[PDB]
Amino acid sequence: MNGTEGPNFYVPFSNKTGVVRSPFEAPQYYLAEPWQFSMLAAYMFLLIMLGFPINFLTLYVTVQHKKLRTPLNYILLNLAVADLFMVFGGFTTTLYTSLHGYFVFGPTGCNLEGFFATLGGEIALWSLVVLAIERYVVVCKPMSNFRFGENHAIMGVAFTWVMALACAAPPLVGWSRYIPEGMQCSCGIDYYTPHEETNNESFVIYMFVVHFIIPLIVIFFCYGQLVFTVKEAAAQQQESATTQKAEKEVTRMVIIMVIAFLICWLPYAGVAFYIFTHQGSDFGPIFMTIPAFFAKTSAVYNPVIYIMMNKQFRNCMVTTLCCGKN
Amino acid sequence: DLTEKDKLKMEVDQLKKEVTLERMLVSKCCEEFRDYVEERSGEDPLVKGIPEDKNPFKEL
Amino acid sequence: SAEEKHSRELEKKLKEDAEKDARTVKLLLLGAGESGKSTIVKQMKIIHQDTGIIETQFSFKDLNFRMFDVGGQRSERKKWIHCFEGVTAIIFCVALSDYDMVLVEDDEVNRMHESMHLFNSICNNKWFTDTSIILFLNKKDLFEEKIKKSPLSICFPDYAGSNTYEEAGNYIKVQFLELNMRRDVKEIYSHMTCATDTQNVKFVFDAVTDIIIKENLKDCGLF
Amino acid sequence: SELDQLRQEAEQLKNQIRDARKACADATLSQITNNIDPVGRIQMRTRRTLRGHLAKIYAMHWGTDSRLLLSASQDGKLIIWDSYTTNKVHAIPLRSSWVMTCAYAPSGNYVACGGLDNICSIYNLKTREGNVRVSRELAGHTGYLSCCRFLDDNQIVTSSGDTTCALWDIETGQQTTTFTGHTGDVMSLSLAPDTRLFVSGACDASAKLWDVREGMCRQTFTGHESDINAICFFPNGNAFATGSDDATCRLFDLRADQELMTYSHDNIICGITSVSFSKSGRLLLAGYDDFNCNVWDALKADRAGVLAGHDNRVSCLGVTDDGMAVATGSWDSFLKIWN
Ligand SMILES: *C/C=C(C)/C=C/C=C(C)/C=C/C1=C(C)CCCC1(C)C
Predict the structure, then answer these.
(1) For residue D310, which of D325, D326, D290, D324 has the smallest C-alpha distance?
(2) D24, D165, D214, D302: which is deepest, by most CB within 10 A?
(3) Is domain D1-339 in CATH 1.10.3720.10, yes or no?
(4) Could you tell me the distance, in angstroms and rounded to a whole number, from the CA of residue A167 to the centre of ligand 1?
(5) C221 touches chain A (CB under 8 A)
């Protein structure tokens, strides 16, 4: 049988022996041993201490001079600023509840943490999509005499903001419910529970049809046209060695980018399709936090593949990190 | 004909014109430059400041 | 507020003309002597459709060009060439029949050492270092007159060691591309042509589309 | 065959006039003026920042209204605006596409430009609505122009790439007179405050003066180890300042043939682009290649003020005659108005 439910919470264990009390009050050590809890706390503290200075430093580097803020690095600055929501709201709270007791905030606190911890992930995802579509439009030249400007980039940043907000807020009232699920540390979304009063089936089918299949198809389309265009361009000018360096550079970076996006937002879609494909399935409580781990690691290795390994940022930000050497 | 054996004749005619010009009194001309600049430098609008009144560059 | 509304209308007109101006590829031509300027300017403008600086303008295959000339206002070189930085493709010109040019205005100056002394004064000049060079070389039918002896060791030391066209023309192109610094990332896209040829504008279009795909990726930071 | 003897005759009389200007041979003015006090620190902040251009800009010139600035962008726009409401008053296209100089009118009526193509184009701005008609076009050269200055509403004076200088009248369309006899190429000039003279600087540091009615040369001033780029004088007509490409701003007097003051400094390493005195003349204004319009005093050779307006190199500047303001021109379209 699936897990047991209270008024406004779900838990992935059975009520066979009658031991699981409310997940807001008196402590729990009967769904997981305490060394698991403290190891989770240590992992999130490590993630805080590494993930704050990368975003703080790229904000300082883009506020120092304006040789760098261009009509195109707006989207990537938005990716730099969305991640500090996930490191500032959605991580210290998990550290707090993992350390002392468990989740002593309250249901309004969960309904706040869920919003501030899904907004960052959603802005990250749609900003990766917008970045891919900007790159394909400005390099492969699909349109008859369309150059690039400033109004279009501010349009794109407003686009990713309105999509992430209007499709991560209707969970707050109506269409879904915020639940603390897993090891009762962070509130996620209610994709697991079968609660039929809150129309939950519509939310899972809507999220899978808008937030994972069309972003994946548009990333594949854009980067495929990009690698085909650069390959066919360097096919012509044979003996020019610099574009023979360029071909290998772009066909390594596209592969590493697509694999980074897929292993940062696959396992959520994995457990959702597995839950929907077998109505009625039992799971361990440690099993439904590995998608949270595989998602929140994109608070560190998502900027390091778009900022540091990117050109034009690194050689300036290192020499205004300590201004000593490379 | 073009410039070569003509520019030198023009230059030595210029230099023969130049030798007849008298000049001295470098200390006197430096004093005169001194008292000309210090005669008016007190009422200069750039050396002292702006009392927010007539300079037509208020911050608006 | 009539003055302010007038300035707003003028500002809209100015920015409209600026975004109209931005979609062109400003090329810069140069080259000393009688080095095929007449042929390369005839073979550019009107053949496809069947004392200051001379601005000839042409367009072909959905990309509108514009090129200038520096051939009529000779002066001190190092003072106005900075006003051309930021153009994309510095078209050079050199004449392949330069072996027989005994003089131009002096008593003894070969034309080959002159154009080499001009070409070194650009690739190291610190105003032109991130702009590629589309070299040319023409009058090849007169260079096909090397069947009669006219040995290549007159304007060189004994290097080519051959007489036919297939080995000599390979030696001159290496002699230019070795004088290149290769300081930063730029590369020189040579060619070969004559007078009665055609469709070499296809070559300069296929070249200039490779300082756009190769260049835009630097701005995105991908390459 | 014989002109080597002419050179040998010239050399000893050149040394003769060298010791003739070493007859007085007093030092610079800082050696005598120990009594005076320094000007003290002086600081300016940006009051208004202009906007509207896209390209680099080269030159500007204050009007005699002390209210109107003109400027010349690289694409072909010649802009003429106010400095009170910060809004554009006219916008002129060019039949050419380059600029290297500009000039306003002492009558405050109409302007003149002309760049690499060897043309001085005078544009009327009096009776036409909007885009104004090209009033006159004046050829007569085979080299690039360098600077134009109005001396009345009638005659202009120009200095071109053909190692000449020429005084023209504009309703006849020809040269009234020439000013030849100059080895290197000229670079700038400025009109003496009583419309009689203009000092002229060139490649080989040979700053020479001229007079208009006689139409011949007057004197020589050679005091620099390299090329110069801009010259102007003191407003009461006694002395003129000069700046070179190796940070050697110097100052001469019109009747002394002597380096009256050097303003060199040990730190600065890159050249200048423009120099203009202020109204009082207590301080010399200048702009260098290291992005700075650092302003010297004019009496005791000290870096009085340092102001870094913008990131690229300054191109040209120049004060207003009533001295209330200072304009400067960037290389990236921002026209700062310091106070
Ligand atoms: C702290 C938690 C984070 C950042 C997790 C956020 C997860 C989502 C916004 C999930 C989205 C989807 C689901 C509802 C399940 C299937 C996969 C998605 C992406 C469609």
Answers:
(1) D290
(2) D165
(3) no
(4) 11
(5) yes
